[PDB]
Design a protein around this ligand. Structure first.
Ligand code: YU7
Ligand code: ZN
Length: 266
């Protein structure tokens, strides 16, 4: 099996590995990067993998140690790929945005790297692997066209998010975020912080404020209350999407729908 650290990396790997080997996701969606410690059973899975796919030590810091013993020809470390360097832009404490799965261009380079490793590891399946890469790139191009068109009429509409993640996706499709607020998903900001957030919401003319699935509706409402800003939800992990050949294209389209759902009209 190919073992991917995070679900959207699973989406990409499952496009390339389809009909060749299973794709597995290491961690449940609810986990994170610095508090999370790997179970010995997780380490075993990594070492048993045909191929490990992860962003790298600036993102899944918790697995850097586990991945040292795995040979280079059995891992794709996305942040360290040669073709990914010119695609990086300025796990949140590092210098670069490491939410790399949100860049269609980085997804493409990831798929190429996965394909290349798999062909070396499983040359008996080269043709199927070539076919899978061909199909992934064709879907990505088609999705890219479709999403770009869905999001084009939304240009210029401002919004805030509770997570500085989406820059790769927003720059690529020409969305115009105003900025981000650090908000605890379980606990609303204090009186002073909330005042400052709410005034920026109105002052900067935001159409929407976007939360994520793990935010308690109460804290989102507390942020949006009084302002005339519509509330939205973005899911940067596509938690509801199953692994499979078409999953990464489905993820990019679902994210567009989530943006559009709050942003369009008014
Ligand atoms: O980037 C982030 N935090 O700053 C994330 C945001 N999420 C969204 C999320 C968290 C918990 C449960 C569901 C979801 Cl969609 C997941 C991560 C995340 C997951 C694994 C590793 C690092 C981050
Ligand atoms: Zn993040």
């Amino acid at each position: 099996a190919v073992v991917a650290s995070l679900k959207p990396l699973g989406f990409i790997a499952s496009a390339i590995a389809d009909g060749v080997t299973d794709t597995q996701v290491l961690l449940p969606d609810g986990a994170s990067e610095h508090d999370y410690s790997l179970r010995p059973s997780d380490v075993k899975r990594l070492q048993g993998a045909d191929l490990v796919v992860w962003v790298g030590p600036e993102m899944e810091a918790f697995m850097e140690k586990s991945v040292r013993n795995i040979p280079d020809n059995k891992q794709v470390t996305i942040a360290q790929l040669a073709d990914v360097k010119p695609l990086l832009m300025k796990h949140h404490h590092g210098e670069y945005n490491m939410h790399l799965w949100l860049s269609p261009e980085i997804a493409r380079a990831t798929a190429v790297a996965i394909h290349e490793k798999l062909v070396e590891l499983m040359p008996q399946s080269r043709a199927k692997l070539d076919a899978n890469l061909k199909d992934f790139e064709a879907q990505l191009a088609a999705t890219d066209k479709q999403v770009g068109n869905e999001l084009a009429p939304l240009k210029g509409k401002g919004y805030f998010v509770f997570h500085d993640a989406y820059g790769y996706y927003e720059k690529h499709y020409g969305l115009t975020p105003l900025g981000h607020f650090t908000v605890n998903p379980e606990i609303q900001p204090g009186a002073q912080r909330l005042h400052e957030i709410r005034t920026q919401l109105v002052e900067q003319k935001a159409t929407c404020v976007f939360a994520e699935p793990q935010f308690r509706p109460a804290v989102v409402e507390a942020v949006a209350r009084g302002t005339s800003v519509r509330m939205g939800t973005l899911d940067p992990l596509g938690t509801n999407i199953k692994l499979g050949k078409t999953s990464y294209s489905a993820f990019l389209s679902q994210l567009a729908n989530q943006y559009a759902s709050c942003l369009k009209g008014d």
